[PDB]
């Protein structure tokens, strides 16, 4: 039984740095990984390991874990960003959990 | 650089000289074995080994002490063996010493 | 392009558990000697100390003793290699002795001020002296204290132990929280055992006091000495020591609290009368419990009274550090290295092995070469399980280090 | 090109059974295991299984009842779910993805295919 709660709604402006936290029990030493998938498409790996970005992907994006918490920040939101977004971790004990998701509702 | 010829802890070696032990000449780098047949062994320096009387190096059903002369050992006391240099196993027990059968070895290697 | 180097995570997929008799494992590569090595690698984050000393190996003049964090990178060409950038050199080398965990954007090393000498030697020579020095694990020019830092705390939660001191390489971070490996020195007075715990049955020549003699360096000893783990709440330098529970109670030797699979795993060598390794997961830490490995194959070599192989409560104080890791759960399959012989340091092999069984292994070096401590340490890069061992191979004494990949196929 | 890709649209009633494949395009079918994904319509990421594609062993699966089950043909390299006894819950799209770094990330999705279990 391991959960990734994470805020259902975050509400940024054009321009400002949008941050979203995933809270799990112990997440500094487990390995997070996040995924956006705007409406009626697949999921796109975007921030994994805490800290890398995967192969051909916008360096916008930026990861960081510390206690019970791993947040990935944005330099700035575009017109792109807007989706929901979902973190996970891998734990031997249960399983690859998921998180619950966020939304991203950006103004314009 | 191979393994030395095993001295029994037996009475009934001969090799054993009277008055002067058994001089082994080993050395550095080396193996030997020492096999138990009612004797506890121990490693001193000089002056126990002239007076010779009363962690053990044996206990006395097949007890076997094997010794490298090279620093790496499993024993955590950390005691060498120095080229150039010399030790002393004897034992003082007798049935239940070092005089008696020149129960000594010389360990100059 | 370059592979990332992370905790071993995640399922198996291939792997590999039925024993295989072919050579498949690769190990992959004056009057000075150095010992007492220290190796901790976490997250892509190596440390390596040591203690140089001059011409006598176990009793030498100490020349001096170097701690030093770098990071686990590919060499390149997709093999693991180990490369630093920071190292550090106390004052004075007598005083600092037997030496990591891993924080965020830290390496905290307690050690052990003792300027008499080893506190194994003479304790009583030891008063109650703890130091903690961290390393910044990336350089950063103008940093000041972030960079090299040097604390020695001022008070220790002891308890029923009179002084405690580090006494293991590698430690765990359960969270914020630090954890370094240590030892206890408490009173022999002090400790109580039941003679009937000791397992006399099944040997003949044993007696039942030789568990709790074996527990003391000898049986006219000061201290027993029992192994634990030494936390530290980063957040908050109140340390309260944290002691192994009574199951499989042996003598406090050199300890590696890692994490593997995301769970912490305890080693610790077989100083005191089981030969045998001894390893397994840990349950709890802040209180501690590790479930021990059924192992019922692999030993250490051994002095006359306790050899390889022996499994008879005798008094015996003598041992080599052989740790192992934890390659997988379900099966699990542990990997390390122990020493061939009964009652000797030679012929060192890295074993892949299971409780009642090993896979594979190979010869580290020839039969007659000696070599007595061994650390190994085992990550995964890039979803094959690596594992990188230090080892003094002998005929300069210099502890080194060679890494092997390890097989998914019985092939 | 890297891509896990499945069939259709599928209309089950309840009580039937639906299989759905999972093809794998452009990678090595044997290195990186394949790892089972349900999104509820209007709901988040639910990780249904991991299923390992060389040993083909007891596929491990998220905790439930023995109704989902995995199996292979590695000549095909192809996965495959059977959802015996559909019921309105186990509805919505059913995406595989491969564990491409073990317990970091799943490094290529599936396209999906909407199973809905419609009465009528
Ligand atoms: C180590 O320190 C942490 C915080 O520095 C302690 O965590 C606190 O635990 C209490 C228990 O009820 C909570 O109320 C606090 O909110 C926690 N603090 C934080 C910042 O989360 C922890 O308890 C300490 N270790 C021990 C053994 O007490
Ligand atoms: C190492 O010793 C093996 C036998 O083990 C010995 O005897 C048993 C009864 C226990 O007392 C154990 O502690 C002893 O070490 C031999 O079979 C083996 O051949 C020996 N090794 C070599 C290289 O000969
Ligand atoms: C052996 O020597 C001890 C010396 O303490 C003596 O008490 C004992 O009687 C001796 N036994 C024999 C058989 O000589
Ligand atoms: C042995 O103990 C004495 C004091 O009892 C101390 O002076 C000496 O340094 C100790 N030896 C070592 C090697 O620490
Ligand atoms: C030690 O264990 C034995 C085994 O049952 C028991 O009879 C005895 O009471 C115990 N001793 C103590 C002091 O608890
Ligand atoms: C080892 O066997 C003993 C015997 O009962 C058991 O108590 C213990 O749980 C076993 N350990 C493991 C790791 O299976
Ligand atoms: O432990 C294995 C050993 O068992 C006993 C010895 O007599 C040998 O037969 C064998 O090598």
């Not at chain 1, 700035?76 to 399983?95: H, I, K, L, P, V």
């Not at chain 2, 059903?61 to 950390?78: A, C, R, V």
């Not at chain 3, 027993?224 to 109140?238: A, D, F, T």
């Not at chain 4, 059913?94 to 317990?103: I, N």
């Amino acid at each position: 039984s391991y959960e990734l709660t994470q805020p259902p709604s975050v509400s940024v402006s054009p321009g400002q740095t949008a941050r979203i936290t995933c809270s799990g029990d112990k997440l500094g030493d487990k390995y997070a990984a996040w995924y956006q998938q705007k409406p009626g498409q697949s999921p796109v790996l975007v921030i994994y390991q805490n800290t890398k970005r995967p192969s051909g992907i916008p360096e916008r994006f930026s990861g960081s874990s510390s206690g019970n918490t791993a947040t990935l920040t944005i330099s700035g939101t575009q017109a792109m960003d807007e989706a929901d977004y979902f973190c996970q971790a891998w734990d031997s004990r249960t399983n690859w959990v998921f998180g619950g998701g966020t939304k991203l509702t950006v103004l314009g | 650089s191979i393994v030395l010829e095993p001295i029994y802890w037996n009475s009934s070696n001969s090799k054993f000289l009277p008055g002067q032990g058994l001089v082994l000449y080993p050395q550095i780098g080396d193996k030997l074995d020492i096999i138990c047949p009612y004797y506890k062994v121990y490693m001193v320096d000089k002056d126990q080994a002239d007076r010779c009387t009363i962690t053990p190096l044996l206990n006395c059903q097949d007890i076997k002490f094997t010794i490298k002369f090279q620093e790496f050992s499993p024993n955590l006391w950390g005691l060498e063996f120095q080229k150039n240099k010399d030790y002393y196993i004897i034992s003082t027990s007798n049935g239940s010493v070092c005089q008696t059968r020149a129960m000594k070895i010389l360990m100059k290697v | 392009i370059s592979q990332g180097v992370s905790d071993l995570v995640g399922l198996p997929n291939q792997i590999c558990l039925q024993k295989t008799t072919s050579t498949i494992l690769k190990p992959r590569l004056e009057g000075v000697c150095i010992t007492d090595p220290l190796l901790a690698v976490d997250n892509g984050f190596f440390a390596y100390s040591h203690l140089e000393k001059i011409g006598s190996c176990t009793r030498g003049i100490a020349k001096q003793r170097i701690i030093g964090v770098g990071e686990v990178l590919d060499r390149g060409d997709k093999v693991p290699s180990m490369f630093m950038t920071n190292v550090w050199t106390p004052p004075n080398p007598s005083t600092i002795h037997h030496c990591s965990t891993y924080h965020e954007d830290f390496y905290y090393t307690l050690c052990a001020v003792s300027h008499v000498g080893d506190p194994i030697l003479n304790s009583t020579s030891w008063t109650e002296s703890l130091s903690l020095i961290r390393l910044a694990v990336r350089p950063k020019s103008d940093s000041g204290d972030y960079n090299q830092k040097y604390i020695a705390i001022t008070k220790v939660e002891r308890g029923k132990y009179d002084k405690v001191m580090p006494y293991g390489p590698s430690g765990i971070k359960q969270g914020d929280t630090l954890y370094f490996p240590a030892v206890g020195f408490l009173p022999r007075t002090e400790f109580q055992y039941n003679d009937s715990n000791c397992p006399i049955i099944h040997c003949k020549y044993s007696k039942a006091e030789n568990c709790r003699l074996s527990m003391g360096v000898n049986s006219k000893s000061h201290y027993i000495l029992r192994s634990g783990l030494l936390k530290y709440n980063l957040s908050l330098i109140i340390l309260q020591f944290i002691e192994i529970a009574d199951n499989r109670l042996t003598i406090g030797s050199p300890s590696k609290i890692y994490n593997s699979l995301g769970q912490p795993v305890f080693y610790q060598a077989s100083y005191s009368w089981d030969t045998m390794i001894k390893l397994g997961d840990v349950d709890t830490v802040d209180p501690l419990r590790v479930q021990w490995r059924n192992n019922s194959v692999i030993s250490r070599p051994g002095q006359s009274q306790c050899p390889r192989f022996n499994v008879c409560p005798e008094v015996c104080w003598e041992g080599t550090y052989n740790d192992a890791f934890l390659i997988d759960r379900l099966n699990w399959v542990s990997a390390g290295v122990y020493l061939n012989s009964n009652q000797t340091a030679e012929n060192p092999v890295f074993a892949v092995f299971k409780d009642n069984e090993i896979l594979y292994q190979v010869p580290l070096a020839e039969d007659d070469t000696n070599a007595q401590k061994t650390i190994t340490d085992c990550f995964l890069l890039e979803n094959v399980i690596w594992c990188i061992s230090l080892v003094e191979i002998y005929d300069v004494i210099r502890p080194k280090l060679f890494a092997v990949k390890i097989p998914a196929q019985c092939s | 090109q890297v891509q896990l890709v499945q069939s259709g649209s599928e209309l089950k009633k309840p009580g039937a059974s639906v299989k759905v494949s999972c093809k794998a395009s452009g990678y090595t079918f044997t290195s990186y295991a394949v790892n089972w994904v349900r999104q509820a319509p209007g709901q988040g990421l639910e990780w249904v299984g991991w299923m390992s594609t060389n040993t083909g062993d007891p596929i491990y699966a998220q905790g439930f009842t023995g109704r989902f089950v995995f199996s292979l043909d590695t000549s095909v390299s192809t996965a495959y779910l059977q959802i015996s006894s559909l019921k309105a819950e186990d509805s919505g799209v059913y995406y595989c993805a491969r564990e491409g770094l073990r317990g970091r990330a799943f490094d290529i999705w599936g396209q999906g295919t909407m199973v809905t279990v419609s009465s009528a």
